[PDB]
Each structure stands twice: as C-alpha cells, then as structure tokens.
Amino acid sequence: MIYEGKAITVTALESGIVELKFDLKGESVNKFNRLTLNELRQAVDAIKADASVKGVIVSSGKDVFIVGADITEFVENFKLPDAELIAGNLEANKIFSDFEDLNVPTVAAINGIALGGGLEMCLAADFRVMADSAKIGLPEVKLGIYPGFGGTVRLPRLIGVDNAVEWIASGKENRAEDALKVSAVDAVVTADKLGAAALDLIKRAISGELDYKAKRQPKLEKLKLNAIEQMMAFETAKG
Amino acid sequence: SLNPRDVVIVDFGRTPMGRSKGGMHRNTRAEDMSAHLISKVLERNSKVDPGEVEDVIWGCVNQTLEQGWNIARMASLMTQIPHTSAAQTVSRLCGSSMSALHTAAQAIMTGNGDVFVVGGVEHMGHVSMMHGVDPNPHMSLYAAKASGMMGLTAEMLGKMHGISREQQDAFAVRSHQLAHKATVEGKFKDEIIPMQGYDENGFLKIFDYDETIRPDTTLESLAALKPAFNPKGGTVTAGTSSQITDGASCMIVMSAQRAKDLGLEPLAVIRSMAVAGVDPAIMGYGPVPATQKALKRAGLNMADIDFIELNEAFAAQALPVLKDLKVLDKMNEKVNLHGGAIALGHPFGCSGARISGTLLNVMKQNGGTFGLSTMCIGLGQGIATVFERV
Amino acid sequence: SLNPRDVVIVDFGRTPMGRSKGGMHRNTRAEDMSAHLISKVLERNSKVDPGEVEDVIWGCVNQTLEQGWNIARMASLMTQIPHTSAAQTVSRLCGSSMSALHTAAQAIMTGNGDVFVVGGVEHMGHVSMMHGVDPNPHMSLYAAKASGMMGLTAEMLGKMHGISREQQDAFAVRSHQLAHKATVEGKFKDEIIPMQGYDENGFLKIFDYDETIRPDTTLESLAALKPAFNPKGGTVTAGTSSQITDGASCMIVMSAQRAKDLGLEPLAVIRSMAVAGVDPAIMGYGPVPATQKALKRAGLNMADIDFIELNEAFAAQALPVLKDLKVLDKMNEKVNLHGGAIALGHPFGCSGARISGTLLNVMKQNGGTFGLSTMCIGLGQGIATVFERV
C-alpha cells in the first residue's frame, strides 16, 4: 500500500481515490499521541508525493473515530518550556495544514466519537460525513485549556463565531443532528452507508460537481463579520 | 399646487394602547381589533366609499395564529370593505406600518388605485415577541447572534455614544409626562378611536385612553430599576424601553385628485419616503441614514422640519439618533411632543403608521408645515417619511 | 422607447423544486435557501453592484420559525448585499411573490430606488401550510369558515362551472407531461439555479431539476385516486391539486435608465399590474377580475397576449378561469407551456415571482411579445402582471 504504519495506513481505491485509515494497532482507540502524529506526517507526505492521487477519504478502523491523547502526555507536554511547547504545536499544526492544503479533495468519514484532536483532524478536511450515532466536540476547556490543533481557527470560520464559542467554551459533545444544523458536518447517514456516502461525495468533488476549493477557502481567510458585528459578538460572548 | 397623483392622508385613527400583560385588549383578537378600527375610521369619513378601496395594506410582524395568513385580508372581510377589494400584509419588523403606507402611496403615484386603507397591528399579549422564533445557526457566520436581541443593541449604541443611565431615565420620565399631559388635555381625542375592552375585573366597557401611560414615573422610581439586558454595567432598563403593548393603527390614503373631487380637506400630504440599512448590532441608529435619504428626496434640510416623531424603542437609541440628526437641543420644541413608545408602547406592526398619525395631529395642533416620522428597525434598518401640511 | 423610470427585469432565477415530504430540501432552511439563490443570481449579473440594491422584497406566507421576523432581511444579511440595503417581507398568501415584484416596480417608477431584488420562498416541509393556524370564530359571522379550506373552494368553483373529474385529471396529466418535456429539453436550464440537497439516503449532491414532476402520471393512475376534500361527490384529488413543495424564486429588477447605463439587455419590461378581490368561497376565480384590470391598464386585449402563466392551484379552478378569460381553446398554444403547479409545486411565498419568471423564459424561447402571469389567492383575491419583451 501507499503507506503502512502502526497507527495509519493509506490504501489506494478506485479512480485514484485514496483512503487514509486510522487504526492504532494494539490499542482500543485512535488518538493523536506522538506516534500517530509522526505517522500522519508520513502519510501526508506520501500522498503529497503520489501524483496519481485524485482524492482522499479519512476514516477509522475502531469503534470511535479519534479521541484525545492520554492525559499522561498532557501533563508531560505542559511541563516543557513555552518555547518548546509552542514549537511542538507549530509542528503538529503544520501537518494538519498540509493535509488541508492537499491539491486534492478530502473527506472525513466520522464513524464514531471524534473529540478534541480527533475533531481538529476532521476540521482540516474539505468535507465531513458523519454517522447518525456518532458524536463530536472539543472538550479542551475541561482541562483548563482550549483547542490547540487549529480548533479555534477552523471551527469559527466553518460554523460561525457564536456557534464555535458555544462549542469551545462548553466542550459539550454534539450529536449528528446538531452538528449538521451548524454545518460542522455536511451530511449525516446511517453507519452502514458511511463508506458509500464518503465515496460518493469524493467523486462529486473530483468531477467538479462540488467545489471543494470554495468550501475550503473560508478557513484560510478572515471571518466574514463586520468590525461592528465582531464587537457585538465577542463582547457579548465574553460577557 | 398638488399634482393629481400626489398622496393625501384623509384621516388617521388608532386604538387605545393596552397593556399586553392583563390589559384592556386581553380578550380581543388581532383581526377583530383591526377590523373594528378600520370600520370606525371609514365610518367617520362617509364620503369615501369602501367599495373604492383598492387594497388594504396592513403591517404585522409575528404572522402566526391570530396574526397569520394575511391578517390584512382577514380583517378586511369583517369590515364594510367589499370582497372586491384586495389586501396584503407587510413586514419590516418595527417599521411594517410605515412600509404599508409607502406601498399604498407608491401605488397611488403610479395609477394602480386611488383609495387605500393602510395601518397595522400587533397583539403581543396573544403573540409574544419571542413566540415561534427559531434562530438560524448559519447567521452567526455573517453577523452576531446578539444583534437579534434588541436590548443588547441598545446597550451597544448607548455605550458607543456615551448615553448615561441618567440621560435615559430623564427621557423616559419626559415620555410618560408628555403622554399624560396630552391625554389629559385631549390632544389624543381626535386620533384615538374609542373601543370596547375589559378592566381588571373582566367588566366590559369602553376605553378612550392609553393604559400604558404611567404618570407616577419619576427619576427616583426609574433609578430603582435594575439593568434589563446587562447585569454588570448595563444602563438600559424596563423603564427606558418601549413597552409590550396591544394596539392597531389606521389611515385612509388616496390620490389628491380623488380628494379634490370628494371635496375633503387633507390631514397632510406625503413629500418623500425612504428606507435604509445599518449594521444589525446598532439597529437603533437606522433613523439617521433613512432620514437623510428622505430629506434629500423631499428637497429639504433637517431645519425645515417643524415637528418630529421618532419611535422610542429605547432611550439609549433615541437620544443618539437625535444628537446625530442635530436636533437634540430642539427636542422639547418639536420631538415626540405627545409622548413616545416608552409611555405609549411599541406594538410592532402598528407603530409605523401610529407615530406618523400622531405626528400629523401634532402638526395640525401646532401649525406645523413639515413633519418627519422615522424609526429604527430590528436587524439593522431605518425608515422615514416626510409630511407636509398644505 | 422605454422611459427612464420604466421597470426592467434584469434576470430570473429559481431553486429546483423539492418535495416537502422527505425531499431534497429537507435539510435546508428557508433563510439559507433564499440567501443562496439571491447570491447566485447576483453572481451571474456581475455588472449589477449589490451595494446598489435599495430593497430586498421577499414574499413568504407562514412567517414564524425559519420564516419569521422579516425573512427578507435575514436572507439578505447572508448575501453579498451590504448591510446598507433594506429588506421587507410581503404576504398576500399565494400571490406574495408577485406583490413583492409590484412593490419594487412601483418603487422604481416613483424614484425611490433604482435596483431591487425581489422573490419569495416557502419551505412547507419546515413550516407546514396549516402550522400555527388559529381560525377566528368571529369570521363565521361574515363569511364561511369552509372558505378557508382551499380544497373546498376548488370543489365549489368546479361544481359551479361544471368541471368534470375527467377534465381535471386531463389538465394534471398535461401538467406533468409538459413539465417533464421542458426539463428533458433543457427549457428550465436558464432559470433553475443548481443547488445542494440530499437524496433519499442523505447523500449530499447538486440538484438541477424539479423532483416534483411525475412523468408516470396518466389518466389511469389519476382515476385511481380518491376525492381529497369531498368523500361523496367530490372531483378534486391530490393528483389535480398543487403540491406541497419547498422552493424559492428570485428576480433582479431595475429602472430602464439604470439598465441602459449598465448596458444590459432586459429579460422583459413590466407594462401593467393589478390585484383584485372576489368572494373567499370561490377564491380560485381571482385571476379573471385581476387580469381584466391589468389588461385595461396595459391598454391591451386578452388577444394581444402571446403567452400565459396561470398558477395551477387546482385543475378545478384553473380550467374555469381559462374559459372565462376566453383562452381555453388557446391553452396548448400559450398557457403554462412548461407545466404548472400541479407538477412543479406551489410553495406559497415563491409562486408569484416563479410563474412570472417561467413566463419570461417561455416568451424568450418562443418569440412572444406580451405575456401575462396571474394567480388566485386564498381568501378571495387575484393578482396579475403584464410583461412585454421589447
């Protein structure tokens, strides 16, 4: 296969479409620990180097999509000096951004729980198809922090300031239904059709039926809000 | 002179304003309230034949339940207005009624009817302002969700123009004070259409005054009120905000030519109309952009205007508008002389035509030549009309 | 020639019509559907600057939830249209959208704006036609409560004009037949604005055709249907009634002067407008009184009209109107050539401008000079517009 690791695999499918699947062998869930981040870097570079790729589908082989790393690593990471911590996050974010900058359409197939880093990975894709039984959210505030992998950047530019604030300041899990209503996700289907829906959506992006570039654009620029509307939104939010 | 197609206001009539919370209209539907009013106004003007009414344009915001399905037609059908006449309901939130007048006016100017009945209604007791409201999540991607909460927009406009708590309370005291004075002196006798209602005991009787007015309102009583929209630092309170009222307003409008023929003296003539937008967050500022556009269309300057009616949504938005309109120092001489929405209430659908009606009577009583009625509109808009007494 | 203040339709655009019951728009809000449409239409006409839009006049009937609080402004705010522009929502039931056009037109004629965006919407899936309806008991004192049930009014108009079950089913078969033909031949290609929706499986994709059309509709399949409003004796069925649909329509309208300056060829020009009333019980008959008034104002005769768009509320009301309009024998030559509401659906707010849009394209495709769009309005009204391709 295009890429074979211990946490991530990139298998070629039909019409040049490729599938990057998360399946942390030996563990019960997927999570962005050191190993996985490093493998994502490699998977991205592998796809970035394979000129035959026409699109990417990001899926999971576990019951969940991707949850947070072990609390243990959070403790360690936060002991490092500010310069190191920030440099380490700059590096992680560079991976997600590179995946976001792929000159090919991308779709995240959310089969189960996608929290924190897991959701942040999804926000990095052009489209997101979610199983009606799954849940997504950013629980970072529960730990006294907030999204660190683009969450505060992508969510607001995708679903709007008020809604992003609501999600980030509460860290609540959101059901498929609600995620669709705020457009955190683009389609909601049953668990059995997740694969087909993701495959169907990617083809429509490739054919040009869906303008994946236009859909991506909003998270690469300033918010649409006025200086006036911004003040209203941020000041009331803080209040 | 007056061109044949100029727009003339033949008469104005409004219901006594009632408290939505257990008030006089608590047992009266929006449709019936509207029909009764229309019926009475047409009765005082026997020379205008109901069959000539081309269209009944009614302003109403929350169009569901009593107010849904084109309440303008529903009310017309219970009037002496024939089934042959048409009817449409207009919504521009707070300015719905004024838009109603503008649409009829414009219809008269283009030869698409000669006689119209305009007005509006809002029974907030039966259809509360937040009833059936479903915020659109996607809206937060372009504007602030908080812009949809009028109170917060008042807070913002106020802070931005530095309107103090004292300044707002003073305006409110003046509003009740002037509304009560006008009531007592019979200044509202011509426009108020007596109507059946119920008192606290459910006793049936006629009301010819606005319940909303609170003469006992002083700086002291208002100072005891707590902020209504911002617990920590807010200056806007219930006492300096327009009231939740039940009311309807009505006007008979027709071409000058038809008014000439029927031999009836115009209450006033329309000289210009205008709507305009501003950011949702500072919706209360809508009047200034709208007033400017209207004054330009009327070929006049703010100074040429003798009397002004500015809807009192919040003292916090009224005062800034007056300052920027450059007439704050002229307030007691020509602004809301008979009180405003803080004392009279702000039934959405009804207000547009209401303040315009009250303006015309203020002009008649004080020998005014030019008048201006204008108001802010939720979600960032302003509307204005220039009237001339000739 | 064209006078500077004549009203020009710069372009027309509509959404693919979706089935309210589990259809393509099932996951799309009325505001978003309206914004997206307005955005796309403005995008195809790059020479018209959004900042010049004086007013966004939108037609919508059940104004509560997704459709409440002036949806016209709610949709505008999520468009490239600036906050400086205004917006109002109009309701005249079925004719809301056409009234929207008339108001903008009249605004243009009187010099109160140069560029306007009109249209309408109705998402019956999210806000069902009977949602929040509260019959007024007092109405029964002036009219029949049954007049509020459109189906029964169709039954009455039909019995009165002797429209048979066969005649009604035939019209319906023709409607689906002609709508399908137009679709296949790309006759709806210019007006339909492709849009995102969902299929039966929830899969996201683009729709550029109307789901409502049912090509398999035959006299045999319709004959199997049972009366929908009168169990014993009724002739009206679900097959010969307009569908419960989700849809939006839109138009860019402006003075001829501005169109001249911007150098853009008019899709058409308005020659006359008119509304009218009839008894609620036979509301479907509204088109004849309105069409007569509009034809007189246009200085034309029914014969001078090359193409006609009559909203298909019920075959039972459409056929009688065509006969009394004296063009039944001209039907297949100039009436609803691309199908009607029976096959395309009747989303209240959207219909008025919709059939008018389809009319213009019918005229352009078949070299017509004069066109007439007209429809019946619930509770006894009719509205009409005369267009000219010059």
Ligand SMILES: CC(=O)SCCNC(=O)CCNC(=O)[C@H](O)C(C)(C)COP(=O)(O)OP(=O)(O)OC[C@H]1O[C@@H](n2cnc3c(N)ncnc32)[C@H](O)[C@@H]1OP(=O)(O)O
């Ligand atoms: C764009 C435009 O032009 S539109 C502007 C839109 N404006 C609005 O929608 C008005 C907003 N107002 C509101 O939402 C409500 O009226 C509110 C929130 C301010 C108040 O409602 P509530 O939350 O129910 O609180 P409440 O109704 O109890 O507040 C009124 C209190 O103030 C007191 N009060 C009000 N006015 C006065 C006065 N003039 N003098 C003395 N006391 C007064 C009342 O006695 C009452 O106190 P009580 O409970 O002891 O009797």
Ligand SMILES: CC(=O)SCCNC(=O)CCNC(=O)[C@H](O)C(C)(C)COP(=O)(O)OP(=O)(O)OC[C@H]1O[C@@H](n2cnc3c(N)ncnc32)[C@H](O)[C@@H]1OP(=O)(O)O
């Ligand atoms: C004044 C103006 O301008 S407009 C007037 C407003 N219009 C109206 O009020 C009529 C709108 N229509 C309606 O409200 C509804 O369709 C009603 C009340 C007529 C019927 O509703 P219901 O009782 O729910 O029946 P329903 O809509 O489910 O349809 C009945 C059956 O006929 C079928 N059917 C409907 N139209 C057709 C057709 N053209 N060809 C074949 N079958 C058809 C349906 O598919 C359905 O069969 P199914 O259940 O197997 O799928």
Ligand SMILES: CCCCCCCCOCCOCCOCCOCCOCCO
């Ligand atoms: C929502 C984002 C959560 C980020 C929180 C990080 C804690 C998770 O641990 C995973 C480790 O990868 C994150 C990058 O680490 C930053 C610092 O990297 C330097 C590590 O120093 C070790 C050198 O041997």
Ligand SMILES: [Hg+2]
């Ligand atoms: Hg308001």
Ligand SMILES: [Hg+2]
């Ligand atoms: Hg209808």
